[PDB]
Amino acid sequence: EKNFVITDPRLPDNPIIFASDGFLELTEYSREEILGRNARFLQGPETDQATVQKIRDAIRDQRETTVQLINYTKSGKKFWNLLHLQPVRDQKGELQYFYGVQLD
Amino acid sequence: KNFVITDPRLPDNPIIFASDGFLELTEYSREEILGRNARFLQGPETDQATVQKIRDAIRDQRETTVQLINYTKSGKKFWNLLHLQPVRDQKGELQYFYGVQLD
Numbered sequence: 624e625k626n627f628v629i630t631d632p633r634l635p636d637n638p639i640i641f642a643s644d645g646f647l648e649l650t651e652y653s654r655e656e657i658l659g660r661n662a663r664f665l666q667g668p669e670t671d672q673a674t675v676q677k678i679r680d681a682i683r684d685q686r687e688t689t690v691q692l693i694n695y696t697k698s699g700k701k702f703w704n705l706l707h708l709q710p711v712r713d714q715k716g717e718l719q720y721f722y723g724v725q726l727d
Numbered sequence: 728k729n730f731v732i733t734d735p736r737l738p739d740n741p742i743i744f745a746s747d748g749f750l751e752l753t754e755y756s757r758e759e760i761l762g763r764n765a766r767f768l769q770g771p772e773t774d775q776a777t778v779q780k781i782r783d784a785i786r787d788q789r790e791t792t793v794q795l796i797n798y799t800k801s802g803k804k805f806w807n808l809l810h811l812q813p814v815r816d817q818k819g820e821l822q823y824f825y826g827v828q829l830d
């Protein structure tokens with residue numbers, strides 16, 4: 624019910640810079656293993672890239688979106704991910720972060 | 728999905744991040760919120776014994792869950808089920824707290 628991450632689109636490859644304990648438990652990764660990496664590590668071969676394209680379009684356009692996609696825990700167990708994404712911009716109107724909430 | 732991040736390495740443990748849900752719940756804008764300690768949500772009917780629990784939990788750097796009166800920007804009373812969680816790095820350094828607000 625409380626699974627979320629913050630990413631930094633200002634750093635190369637838009638890596639995760641924060642994850643809740645819920646996200647860690649959901650995905651089986653530790654904070655050490657996750658931070659500094661783009662969340663795409665949760666994807667795998669059975670993930671539909673057309674569905675990821677919607678995420679891509681939202682990030683480019685810098686707008687919120689919500690999509691369902693196949694995701695893999697560290698061990699390769701699949702987990703339910705209804706992903707909600709939201710951009711955050713600073714006072715000068717420049718994109719600052721994205722936050723993402725994983726519903727399961 | 729109402730949540731905030733604070734930075735306890737910064738003076739008075741101020742909010743450095745707030746979700747849109749938190750903004751809508753409290754009626755504040757992000758500009759009005761960042762750099763401030765979350766206590767501005769408190770007011771006259773906020774149980775001071777409950778604030779002491781949050782106080783001790785932050786002191787000991789442990790997670791906690793409490794229920795207390797908060798006030799929106801317009802002064803509107805609301806009950807806040809607040810969940811706090813500290814985050815530290817691999818070298819043991821306390822880095823953030825995150826909090827999640829249920830109303």
Ligand SMILES: Cc1cc2nc3c(=O)[nH]c(=O)nc-3n(C[C@H](O)[C@H](O)[C@H](O)COP(=O)(O)O)c2cc1C
Binds near residue numbers: 630682692708723725
């Ligand atoms: C805040 C945020 C959270 C994200 N969470 C997930 C996630 O939980 N699972 C996932 O498969 N992709 C997630 N993504 C998507 C990837 O990070 C990336 O945007 C997507 O794979 C498209 O980028 P790419 O084409 O370079 O791989 C998230 C993206 C952002 C910005």
Ligand SMILES: Cc1cc2nc3c(=O)[nH]c(=O)nc-3n(C[C@H](O)[C@H](O)[C@H](O)COP(=O)(O)O)c2cc1C
Binds near residue numbers: 765785809811
């Ligand atoms: C991450 C985080 C989120 C918090 N959210 C709230 C909140 O939503 N409402 C509230 O009344 N206090 C909240 N607090 C508690 C206050 O910031 C403060 O710690 C509390 O009032 C006790 O400190 P004080 O005695 O110095 O005021 C939060 C604290 C942290 C660390």
